[PDB]
RNA sequence: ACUUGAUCUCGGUGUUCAGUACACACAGGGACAGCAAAAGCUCGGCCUAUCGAUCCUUUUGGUUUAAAGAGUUUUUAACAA
RNA sequence: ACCUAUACAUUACCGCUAAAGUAGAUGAUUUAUAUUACUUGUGAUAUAAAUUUUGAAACUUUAGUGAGUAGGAAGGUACAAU
RNA sequence: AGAUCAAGGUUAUGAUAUAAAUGUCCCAGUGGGCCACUUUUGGUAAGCAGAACUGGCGCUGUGGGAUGAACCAAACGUAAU
RNA sequence: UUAUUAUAUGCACUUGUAUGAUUAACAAUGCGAAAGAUUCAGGAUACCUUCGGGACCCGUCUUGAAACACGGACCAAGGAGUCUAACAUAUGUGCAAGUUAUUGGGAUAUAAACCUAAUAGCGUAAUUAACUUGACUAAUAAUGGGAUUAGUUUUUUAGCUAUUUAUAGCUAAUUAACACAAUCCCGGGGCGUUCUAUAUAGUUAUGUAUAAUUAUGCCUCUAACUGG
RNA sequence: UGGAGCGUCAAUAUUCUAGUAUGAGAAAUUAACGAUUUAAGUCCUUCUUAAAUGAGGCCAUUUACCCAUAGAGGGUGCCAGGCCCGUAUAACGUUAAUGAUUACUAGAUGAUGUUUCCAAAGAGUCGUGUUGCUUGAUAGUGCAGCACUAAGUGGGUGGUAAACUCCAUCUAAAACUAAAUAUAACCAUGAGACCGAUAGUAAACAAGUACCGUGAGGGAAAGUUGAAAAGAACUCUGAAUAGAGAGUUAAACAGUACGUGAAACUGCUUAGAGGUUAAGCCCGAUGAACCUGAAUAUCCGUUAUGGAAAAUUCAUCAUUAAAA
């Protein structure tokens, strides 16, 4: 039936998001829940509710709306849709990363998720900078 | 319809002589067409590997008809899978209001052979034929091998 | 393995690897007193590899 | 050449390539043949859709003692033995074919009762709808009763699996049925040589009178 | 060759699959003698194994 | 082994309608093995017709 | 001097060797015998050459099997040497 | 004395071949410190910060080693269609 | 000649193990060889003819013999010393 | 007794030495420099210039080709190990004493897919030229039996980590058990052929004894049947 | 695989069957065919500025301009469901077929047992012999030629020739007959894992053409300007086709080798160089030329320490509301 290892050996190579690029030995998934965008087994669309990712924002720049996994109340046979929950920290460029370790404890993506929210918060910022040089 | 990369020609192409030799080229028919000559220049190949080619043993039956040797076969080994094994437990209490009735020609079989080593219940077997050991090893158990018509 | 991971109280068996009838034909010199190894005929009968080189009358007994 | 392989007999020496048949219209002969059955079942009537009656059991040889040659006949004694109407049976659709020389009582009965099963369910349209001798009805005219033209006209098809679990459970099972077979064969082997001995025993005493 | 098209069952469609490929308990009625295939590994979750 | 295992499949209707009183059980084909290696090998061949 | 072992049967081994067949040889089992007072010796020639498949013809053997609708007799065929 | 090979040797790198190791991450591990059981002494608990996925078809460790026609096997690569 | 008991010390030369054992596909190719030490036959001799052993060439580059299919060193992943 | 050596250095603290295929400390030179733009290293990329070293023309057959062997002036397009049939092995997959719609039929959405009755192949039993005949003492048995057995159970022994000294893991010493697979030996059956037992009695029935095919006696002329 | 008549039993006979007229059905069904309707945006901006068929937009209706039983295909200056032909449902139309009744035409009462009565039935043919071809056909499978040449409880066959006893099975030597079946031709269609102008037919075109052979026969090469010819007026020079200006187009680097425009080979320009392996070439460097890459939080630290700004589910914060 359903387990993230049976699901994955069907998906391992014949995927629709895996899009390997030309020298680099078999990686890249273009998934919406990958956060370290290769294709591992436990960076994946569905690995069954270890499925966290980090998305901006919607309002650039402050947010990073984080789709937290919508878990084991779901099989995840769908939900009267629930299973992405989107709790989105904001308002401080380096406080919210403590408030993401503070948030989740699902210690497998944890240092590879706030490695991503930083790398979104590195990117959304630079509007009032990179200007004058007078 | 056959996956060609695993065919050798995808791979041998192109080295020159395509797997067949420089000295001893792939020519058209360098030994004879077909079973030539299994009695001169292929005789070693024809005995071994087929001892018994090239003769006549004999009795000619002009127009054999395949009904006069039909006789399908069954040993005592089955004989009791033809009634249910779930109808074997009840006669194995023990309680013999039985032998059962087996009509082996209604199934498809005629000759009841005797490989077997069948249990201690009797049977009543209506088949068209007999072995010597099918008659014994049933009537020892009580029942009777009986002639179907 | 979730019950006996180390295999305590198990009986690990295998049926015969040469039970099958492809294996009946390996390997064949008629001329030795021990072959008994089953040609690749098409059909079982007289006038199918049963004459010269099998019978002591026709030819020889193999 | 080489190896232990199976002497070949492929019969490809006769300009065979001009004898090749395609089979690519396997499917639209299945469709052709089916649209004709639909065409023909509508262009009969409420009359049955196959539909003759096709008698027999007892296919010939010792393999098929039981699985039918498909009954052409109904062999006029079986008509005459069953209340019809030998020329008349053909006009219903009974398929009267007058080449079979019915060799059994029981094969004659097997089809007589087949000719009584049908003809008891064979509904009869009247001609002029006064219908003095029906024998069935005109209010069992098919619109009222059947109008079916059902599809198969089945053959009641052959039970024998079975196994009927019986007690016989014999007392006189002390009889050597394996050796009746050995005694029967030599009885049929020595018919003539007993009969030759049944000549000299019928003629050596005639040498006593002279 | 790629399993899993997005599918929509109606109600009386969905209620017939326990007949076609029968059930784990009993065989099927609409496919004579058919018996649902058994997996080589019933529990199939390695991370709990 | 089970046939049940997630044994309630809700039915939906036209207004996206979670709510019925009709809740049918998961019809036990859905536990049978997914094997894409045999599906690809039947697909390779059956669409040659 | 006296003899017929120069016989009958079943496989196995040596040589040639592909480690195939003929052929020759050898070691035996079974049977029937010869010489010899017996022990024993003999399965041709004191040992190493002196030889020949299939198919067909043929003869000798069973008190033979088959000719497929059934009986008997001719015939034909089969099997063994 | 000395010069001189694609040999010898020690090193870097490529492959091959042969072994060996790793998958409880609602876990493991640091550094401090509060408390602590206290065994003198070292552990266990709380806090604060930190590191900790890999197409397991992967990653890590170790050693030897490399001629080749005819020829065979593996892995890639170009072309065009479903 | 065997079937089960009783007794038996330290396992019965040396040095080796790039793993060995075994099936199948008896799968590909091959079934023209030439060269050389020592042995050797025919020929008067032959860069001729024919054999025995080992090693080579064939398939093999590099160093040396100015030169070379076989001689003498040495066997070959890309580089430094 | 003359000497010699090792052990009897914890607690902190260093920018210290070693060891994780033991290279790193000091300086100099020069600013990725907003666009704009130099410095230092490198680039036989694909050529031209200058020297040194090496360097024969490929394909082929051949023992041996740069050959005074054959083909090739050059260039673009084309251009050669395939379809089929039948086997055999290996591997993949499905079901398993079975399996296999596919000639057909049915449903039907369209040369597909689905569903399916009677067979039919192949397998499940063989061997004879043929007629005969037809597979282990037995309600049970993997070449029955024997060896060499991977492995699970098991023996007690010190014994090892933990010990509650309970309960494990470990080697074996070693007991017993089954011994998978595979090969190697000895058997036993089916059928065939041959010798042999039967001198045969005898084993069952026809016959025979009677009654009335029938009933039962029993000898056995007859057939069947047993034997190494 | 037989009958014909009689007795005879049973049923029965104003009757039905067949056929032509037949208006069946106030055109009724069904089928063919041409049909016939286009349903719905050429709605707004952007690039082409040569053309939108593209790209962005079109309240809500849980977000989609409209239709969709019509998102097959084709045409339209580029990729078009809504431009157009169609397409789907259909109507509309002309055909046909199912003849209800009526008329005449023409035919007809048995099937049922019985034993009476005459109870036939294909010759130079069957078959034998022989010869030749033929077949799996074997001491003849078929067929043919020649000599012989029949019988009527007969004659044939019954995969081993032969006599003899039976058994089984059909009726030769005369005649028809639909369906299933076949189909590189002919009419008329729909397709495809096919070929894409040296391929596919030989032939995509004025292709069995041009040509060649006395003949039989043989047998090519040969597609592409652009959306539209708007196919270059006019001027100069020439004896002139032509050149040079100009013009046309989005483009003439699309001007009738008319899309692209490769190699082979080369005229011209620019660069450097030249008496050795003929030239090429390998490897190391070279001059010239061009080029690629280049760096920020520390010693004996992501340490000591002062300024601003903004602000807070952060505090020692506290309640409150959730959703996990």
Curated annotation (Swiss-Prot), chain A:
One of its Pfam families is Ribosomal_L28e
Work out whether the entry's keyword set contains Ribosomal protein.
Answer: yes
User: What are its GO cellular component terms?
Assistant: cytosolic large ribosomal subunit; cytosolic ribosome
Q: Where is this region: Disordered?
A: 121-134
The record, for InterPro entries, names:
Ribosomal_eL28, Ribosomal_eL28/Mak16
- GO biological process assignments: cytoplasmic translation
Per UniProt, what is one GO molecular function of this protein?
structural constituent of ribosome
**Keywords for this entry?**
Ribonucleoprotein, Ribosomal protein
Asked if the record carries the keyword Ribonucleoprotein, the reply is yes
Q: Which family does it belong to?
A: Belongs to the eukaryotic ribosomal protein eL28 family.
Could you identify this protein by its name?
Large ribosomal subunit protein eL28
Gene encoding it? Answer: RpL28
UniProtKB/Swiss-Prot annotation, chain B:
Molecular function terms from GO: structural constituent of ribosome
| Database matches in Gene3D superfamilies | 3.100.10.10
SUPFAM superfamilies noted in UniProt: Ribosomal proteins L15p and L18e (SSF52080)
The answer to whether the entry has keyword Ribonucleoprotein is yes
Its Gene Ontology cellular component terms are: cytosolic large ribosomal subunit; cytosolic ribosome
Q: Per the record's keyword annotation, is Cell cycle included, yes or no?
A: no
Q: Where is this region: Disordered?
A: 1-37
- Which Pfam families does the record associate with it? Ribosomal_L27A (PF00828)
Give the GO terms filed under biological process for this record. cytoplasmic translation
UniProt KW keywords: Ribonucleoprotein, Ribosomal protein
> Which InterPro entries does UniProt cross-reference here?
Ribosomal_uL15, Ribosomal_uL15/eL18, Ribosomal_uL15/eL18_sf, Ribosomal_uL15_CS
Where does this protein have compositionally biased stretches of type Basic residues?
Answer: 1-31
Q: Can you tell me which family this protein belongs to?
A: Belongs to the universal ribosomal protein uL15 family.
What name has this protein been given in UniProt?
A: Large ribosomal subunit protein uL15
Gene for this protein?
A: RpL27A
UniProtKB/Swiss-Prot annotation, chain E:
Q: Would you identify the family this protein belongs to, as annotated?
A: Belongs to the universal ribosomal protein uL4 family.
Name listed for the protein in its UniProt record? Large ribosomal subunit protein uL4
Q: Which organism is it from?
A: Drosophila melanogaster
Q: Which residues of the full protein are shown?
A: 247 to 295 of 401
From Swiss-Prot, chain F:
UniProt family annotation? Belongs to the universal ribosomal protein uL4 family.
Q: Which gene encodes it?
A: RpL4
Q: Where are the transmembrane segments?
A: none
Q: What is this protein called?
A: Large ribosomal subunit protein uL4
From-to range in the entire protein, with total length: 2 to 50 of 401
């Amino acid at each position: 039936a359903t387990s993230s290892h049976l699901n994955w050996l069907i998906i391992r190579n014949n995927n629709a998001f895996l899009l390997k690029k030309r020298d680099v030995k078999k990686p890249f998934s273009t998934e919406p829940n990958n956060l370290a965008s290769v294709s591992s087994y436990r960076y994946s669309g569905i690995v069954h509710k270890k499925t966290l990712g980090v998305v901006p924002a919607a309002d650039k720049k402050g947010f990073t709306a984080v789709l937290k996994k919508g878990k084991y109340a779901q099989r995840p046979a769908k939900n009267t849709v629930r299973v992405d929950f989107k709790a989105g920290p904001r308002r401080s460029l380096k406080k919210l990363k403590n408030l993401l370790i503070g948030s989740k404890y699902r210690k497998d993506l944890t240092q590879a998720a706030l490695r991503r929210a930083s790398a979104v918060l590195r990117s959304q910022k630079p509007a009032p900078v990179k200007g004058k040089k007078a | 319809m056959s996956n060609i990369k695993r065919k050798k020609t995808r791979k041998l192409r192109g080295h020159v002589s395509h797997g067949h030799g420089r000295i001893g080229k792939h020519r058209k028919h360098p030994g004879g067409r077909g079973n030539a000559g299994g009695m001169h220049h292929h005789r070693i190949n024809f005995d071994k590997y087929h001892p018994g080619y090239f003769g006549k043993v004999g009795m000619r039956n002009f127009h054999l008809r395949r009904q006069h040797k039909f006789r399908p076969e069954i040993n005592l080994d089955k004989l009791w899978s033809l009634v249910g094994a779930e109808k074997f437990a009840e006669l194995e209490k023990e309680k013999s209001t039985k032998a059962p009735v087996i009509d082996l020609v209604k199934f498809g079989y005629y000759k009841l052979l005797g490989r077997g080593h069948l249990p201690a219940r009797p049977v009543i077997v209506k088949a068209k034929y007999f072995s010597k050991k099918a008659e014994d090893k049933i009537k020892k158990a009580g029942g009777v091998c009986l002639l179907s018509a | 393995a979730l019950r006996s991971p180390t295999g305590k109280n198990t009986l690990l068996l295998q049926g015969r690897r040469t039970a099958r009838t492809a294996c009946k034909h390996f390997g064949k010199a008629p001329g030795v007193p021990h072959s008994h190894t089953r040609p690749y005929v098409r059909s079982k009968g007289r006038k199918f590899e049963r004459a010269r080189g099998r019978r002591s009358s026709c030819g020889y007994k193999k | 050449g080489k190896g232990n392989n199976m002497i070949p007999n492929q019969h490809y020496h006769k300009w065979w390539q001009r004898h090749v048949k395609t089979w690519f219209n396997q499917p639209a002969r299945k469709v052709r043949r089916h649209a004709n059955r639909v065409k023909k079942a509508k262009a009969v009537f409420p009359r049955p859709a196959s539909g003759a009656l096709r008698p027999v059991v007892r296919c010939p040889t010792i393999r098929y003692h039981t699985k039918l040659r498909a009954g052409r006949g109904f062999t006029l004694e079986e008509l005459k033995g069953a209340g019809i109407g030998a020329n008349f049976a053909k006009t219903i659709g009974i398929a009267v074919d007058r080449r079979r020389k019915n060799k059994s009582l029981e094969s004659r009965q097997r089809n007589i009762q087949r000719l009584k099963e049908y003809r008891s369910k064979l509904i009869l349209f009247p001609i002029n709808e006064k219908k003095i001798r029906a024998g069935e009805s005109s209010l069992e005219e098919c619109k009222l009763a059947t109008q079916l033209k059902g599809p198969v006209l089945p053959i009641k098809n052959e039970q024998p699996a079975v196994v009927e679990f019986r007690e016989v459970t014999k007392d006189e099972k002390k009889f050597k049925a394996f050796a009746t077979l050995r005694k029967a064969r030599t009885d049929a082997r020595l018919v003539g040589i007993r009969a030759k001995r049944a000549k000299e025993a019928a003629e050596s005493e005639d040498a006593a009178k002279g | 060759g790629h399993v899993g098209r997005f599918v929509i069952w109606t109600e009386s469609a969905f209620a017939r699959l326990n007949d076609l490929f029968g059930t784990w308990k009993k065989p099927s009625t609409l496919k004579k003698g058919y018996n649902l295939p058994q997996p080589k590994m019933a529990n199939t979750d390695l991370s709990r194994l | 082994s089970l046939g049940n295992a997630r044994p309630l499949v809700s039915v939906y209707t036209e207004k996206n309608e979670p709510a019925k009183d009709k809740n049918i059980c998961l019809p036990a084909v859905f536990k049978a093995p997914i094997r894409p290696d045999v599906v690809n090998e039947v697909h390779q061949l059956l669409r040659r017709n």
